[PDB]
Amino acid sequence: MALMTWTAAEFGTNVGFADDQHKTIFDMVNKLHDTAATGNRSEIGKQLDALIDYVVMHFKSEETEMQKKGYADFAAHKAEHDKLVGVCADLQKKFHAGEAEVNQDTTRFVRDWAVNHIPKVDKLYGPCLSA
Ligand SMILES: [Fe+3]
Ligand SMILES: [Fe+3]
Ligand code: NA
């Protein structure tokens, strides 16, 4: 049972690149979720690291477009990104020190974050970025 399922109704932004990057995030989170129910710590870490790298790139992609187009709520939206990047960096620090584990609570938090962020934050840039 996949943790996350993308639909257009719930998550579509009317912005092609963003919808595509979102669908990749959901697939990479789903993979990490399944791995996080095991004790395969090396595989957990590789999938965690891949997912974080991709998310940071997604945020940059959204920010570069918002800023270039003079989107009204760019700085607020970047602030929400930058707080999750700080949480991700802190988790990588603790995980790669052997001080914290990644488990299905970790991936449920990323789920919770995304399923709030996409509809309530990302969908707001649609009109600007699809114009
Ligand atoms: Fe997004
Ligand atoms: Fe965003
Ligand atoms: Na995300």
Side-chain angles (χ1 to χ4, degrees):
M1 169 83 289
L3 178 62
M4 300 186 73
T5 299
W6 190 102
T7 59
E10 263 190 278
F11 300 119
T13 64
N14 200 213
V15 182
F17 78 86
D19 292 340
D20 286 339
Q21 295 181 328
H22 295 154
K23 288 176 203 185
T24 292
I25 291 167
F26 277 42
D27 281 350
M28 295 179 83
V29 171
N30 286 335
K31 284 174 161 59
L32 181 58
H33 191 249
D34 279 344
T35 304
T38 81
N40 301 309
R41 201 185 190 269
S42 179
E43 306 191 319
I44 292 166
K46 289 183 175 182
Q47 189 65 23
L48 174 73
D49 291 346
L51 168 63
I52 290 167
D53 192 75
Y54 191 81
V55 168
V56 166
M57 181 282 292
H58 168 58
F59 288 171
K60 288 182 183 152
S61 301
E62 292 188 347
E63 294 162 21
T64 294
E65 299 301 310
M66 282 185 284
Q67 192 169 209
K68 168 187 184 63
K69 293 175 169 186
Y71 172 63
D73 300 308
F74 166 54
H77 191 141
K78 180 171 184 305
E80 301 303 340
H81 290 170
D82 284 342
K83 286 287 177 182
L84 185 78
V85 176
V87 163
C88 289
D90 187 60
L91 172 63
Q92 281 181 312
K93 259 129 209 213
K94 291 174 178 16
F95 176 88
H96 289 304
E99 295 165 3
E101 301 308 326
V102 166
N103 58 38
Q104 284 194 338
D105 287 10
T106 312
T107 46
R108 285 185 286 270
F109 172 75
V110 175
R111 183 279 304 286
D112 292 342
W113 193 100
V115 302
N116 289 337
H117 182 86
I118 296 167
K120 301 260 183 20
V121 191
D122 287 349
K123 283 186 190 191
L124 300 182
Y125 60 50
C128 180
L129 272 47
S130 69

